[model samples]
Target chain A: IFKVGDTVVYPHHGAALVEAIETRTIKGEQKEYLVLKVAQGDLTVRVPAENAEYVGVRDVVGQEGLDKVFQVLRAPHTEEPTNWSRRYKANLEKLASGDVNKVAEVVRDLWRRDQERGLSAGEKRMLAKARQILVGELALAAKAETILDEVLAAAALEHHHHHH
Target chain B: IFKVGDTVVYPHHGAALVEAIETRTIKGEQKEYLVLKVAQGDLTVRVPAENAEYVGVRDVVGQEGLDKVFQVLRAPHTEEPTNWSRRYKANLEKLASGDVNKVAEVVRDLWRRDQERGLSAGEKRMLAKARQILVGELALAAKAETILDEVLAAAALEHHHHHH
Candidate 1:
């Protein structure tokens, strides 16, 4: 069971802090819920404590996992499907996995694609949301001042030789 | 004098195509105006022909200028001010320059920073606008299906040796 103040990743919501575990009555039944304060926005959500696993809530990555996240970000680009619709679906599935590395790949690939050609409005928004999710978790796991510096550092280090 | 089919960059807007040169009477004064269809959004703007220069309306970048835009995107990163407000203002000034290279710099810098830390709601919107302006102009000037492929190739070639 996760405790209050513990950082967790919610499949749909990204990184959040467990605010409290409270009992509430729903449908005339008393049940416990996990209150989460989402890191991306000023949003609070309540998930039934017993169904946390069912909802895909998981602990934030530890130090080693954080290293893996960077590795994914720096990894060589893979050839994504050329079709936009198919690529969008594949990215969505990756996000659904609730895996930090997968989310990082989505961000990296989409970002590279965005640079090549502009994204459609929907894809643009998708990239922003995926990035928020990945940055949120990275911030929590790395204890960084903000995701911006961490991202900047990664890009700088990886591309240092290429800068002219 | 700008003519129909000519591309122009509108200050505070981005690149646009001149749809027509129309004369309309306001208060019984017949004034010639340039009908501009903005490239990024489905919005049309009418500016008095005589006032176009005063309003910061100017011709779009040509092929050589387009090359400079890509160069700016691949250029070495410069440290942005740490303060968000300061950075925003600086970026805004760059966009206002109506120079594609400056716009590209804004996109590259903000994009890198965004990947590191999440952008605030306003900055996120700002980055999108800046990118749209840069990409819209590049696509038109280069006459390409999308600038995505060019950018992707550059990224792949430059970082080829760094991949683990």
Candidate 2:
């Protein structure tokens, strides 16, 4: 079950967190719906039991598995051409291949290039989309979106303050 | 086993590869080693049976499983304060508490925010180390590294791009 602060992604939408898990007394069946507050904050989603899978609530990849995938995705690009479109295509194909580690590497390589050249609007969107695919899958598999969000947020902050 | 044009990761050097698994050699009564040609060039690596796992040559997380994890990790974040450090601590605790998904969320969120704010040098290192820890443990539990490069390369590239 998800809790407040848990990160999750709906299959159709991008990424989100479980801000609240609301329970309602609908006649006799106590129904529970997950309230996911998305990145934009303009939309709050309610995931019912019947559609949790569709909403990507039932399937989550645990944190340990996530790290493994992240490692492969972040591998170095080596001495290669920097044409944004070409790199973007390569990264996309890697992600599309459905290998989490490969996707992570693509994200890492593109992210590097983005830093060097600054991401084009198109590249930024695609990069974000790629990340969304992995994050959503992990959150659903883990089934602890609240914990996932809190942990992810913390790690991000720590890295920011100390790394660069 | 693996084949040409297949992507792989090397644990010792913290590298990823898109290469050809040339062929396997047998010695006496056991499978000795598998030869591989690095994808980008003519370089080849002969992976001994004992070192295959270390190099992340085999399937860390199967394609289907990796896809599932990606979906979860990529889910959108909710409207919360941007201070990711607190989130990291919470995630670390969750991970320590044995929730693997929480750890994955922590890594992803940490990475997402790192992309936005830029990761510091120390934070980048810590993030990589933390990721390694999570992956190592999960390696025993699930026998896979789904999107390993994504995490590592993101941290490395972020550090290199920002620092240099």
Candidate 3:
């Protein structure tokens, strides 16, 4: 139930304000539309209103969700794919799917890489965008302002290496 | 490796004596053939032979295989199918597959039904043939003559009901 003024993230478009929940008709099955303004870029779009979580546009998770993120943050990351091109694109697609779990996962993974091999030119900015997803909503949920990497390192410190 | 005088069971048939491991070429992939004579019916058929166990014509179980059969005998049987016709046809097909394990399974199932609802017209004779497969093989394996229900009852004692 995404209502107007609820903060939601559209993965490609960053955190968006539900500017209005308006109705539109122009030979369309979607009689209802969502007016969304990107909190990062001051950009705006009107998209169809539907189940936000299912179709890659999802509500920013709560303190419960933040705790779940910490659960991932505290765990070890498994390395992926043989080729960097395959791995990067594969990871990018998952991050782009707009799942908060997927976001938590890839961020945890690439953050691990940053501490290890250090990220490539592509991943450095992608990591910046990744934090844009995590930091903004969490700031709202935590009811305070948050600088990206202070909290990033705070979450990073939550990690404990697991033996399998 | 079925040798001459080796006992094997062919499901649609009975426990058969491998009278000879004779070779014949009648325009075929199989230059070798099996000479088998049914113990119960006193009938015989020469069939193109390869891996006896694969095509459902399998060698009689020895003491080791008999132990394996007892393992199945000592377990509870899951009942099958909503309709009797489908159930009977399915069971018949499995019986005709000629794996002693499959034969052991159906015999266990129908045996359960015999105690409870009592078997219908078809399964009564099928049960008798199932015993022919088991009884003759166990007779050779144990190096003694074996009667059907006596050994069946003996294996049935080994059952210990498992709690899930």
DockQ per candidate: 0.01, 0.02, 0.00
Error of 3 at A101 (Å): 70
> What TM-score does model 3 achieve against the real structure?
0.29
- Stretches of candidate 2 off by over 4 Å are A1-64, A73-81, A141-164, B1-164
Models 1 onward score TM values of 0.29, 0.27, 0.29
Each model's fraction of native contacts: 0.00, 0.00, 0.00
Q: Mark the 10 consecutive residues where model 1 chain A has the least summed lDDT.
A: A4-13
Candidate 3 lDDT over B36-93, as tens digits, reads 4432223333333432321121244632354456557657446578688987888788
Candidate 3 ranges beyond 4 A from true positions: A1-164, B1-60, B141-145, B154-158, B162-164
RMSD after CA superposition, every candidate: 23.5, 21.2, 28.4
lDDT for each residue of candidate 3 in A1-164, tens digit (9 for 90 to 100): 11111111111112334545666453443345444443222333333343122112223463235445656654544556767798789778877887766676667777656654668898887777776775654553332234333444344423332232
Candidate 2 global lDDT? 0.42
> What digit string (tens of lDDT, one per residue) describes model 1 on residues A6-80?
111111112344556677665566666555444222444443454342112224463345445545654553678
Scored on chain A only, each candidate's TM-score is 0.52, 0.44, 0.53
